[PDB]
């Protein structure tokens, strides 16, 4: 016998540590573009490879090089623990995604390219040019080692 069990770990704040909140339009820090949710040539139930924290260019495609970076994907539809949008979209279908652009205190360690490669110095410069602070130090946690 097997006990089908799962864990719901993960969080949203880890990708956006802080924001500059404008007393006017509170959406000043974001932009919406139409990305591809399900893989274009995959099957009908091939859940999206997109993950929160992936750099996205202004054209909407996930970034692959430092020069092609414009923002960070922080859409609610991709956050951990709420990724139930499995098979709800046709292959290659477009969908508007929320991008974080300016006025953010981001976390460096969670920024990655399309393939998962970590962000580099050129990417840091390009992303900070919009007015973003890419912090390089979050404390982290050690849960139980029997020593520390």
């Amino acid at each position: 016998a097997k006990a089908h069990v799962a864990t719901l770990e993960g969080n949203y704040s880890d990708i956006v540590l802080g924001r500059v909140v404008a007393f006017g339009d509170t959406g000043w820090n974001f932009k919406e573009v139409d990305m591809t949710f399900i893989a274009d040539d995959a099957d009908a139930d091939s859940k999206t490879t997109l993950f929160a924290g992936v750099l996205v260019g202004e054209d909407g495609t996930p970034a692959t090089a430092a020069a092609g970076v414009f923002g960070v994907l922080v859409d609610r539809k991709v956050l951990p623990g709420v990724d139930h949008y499995i098979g709800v979209f046709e292959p290659g279908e477009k969908v508007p995604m929320v991008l974080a652009v300016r006025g953010l205190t981001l976390n460096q360690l969670k920024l990655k390219y399309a393939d998962g490669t970590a962000i580099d110095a050129a990417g840091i410069q390009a992303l900070e040019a919009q007015g973003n602070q890419v912090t390089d130090k979050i404390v982290g946690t050690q849960f139980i080692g029997s020593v520390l």
């Binding site: 339009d25 959406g27 000043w28 609610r76 508007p96």
Partner: protein, 55 residues
């Protein structure tokens, strides 16, 4: 979507115009010769009076 940019309401229009007004008078006078020595039309012998003509 929940979190993205919001919408706004930024339209309006106004106008203002001025016009004049016309004038309409009307007046009549009554002399002695109109009433004295005459009857009131629908009362046979009763003498004419100024008040009936005025009304």
């Amino acid at each position: 979507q929940r979190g993205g940019v919001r919408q706004h309401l930024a339209n309006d229009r106004k106008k203002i115009v001025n016009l004049n007004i016309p004038f309409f008078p009307l007046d009549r006078s009554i002399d002695r010769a109109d009433i004295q020595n005459f009857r009131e039309f629908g009362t046979e012998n009763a003498p004419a009076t100024v008040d009936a003509e005025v009304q």
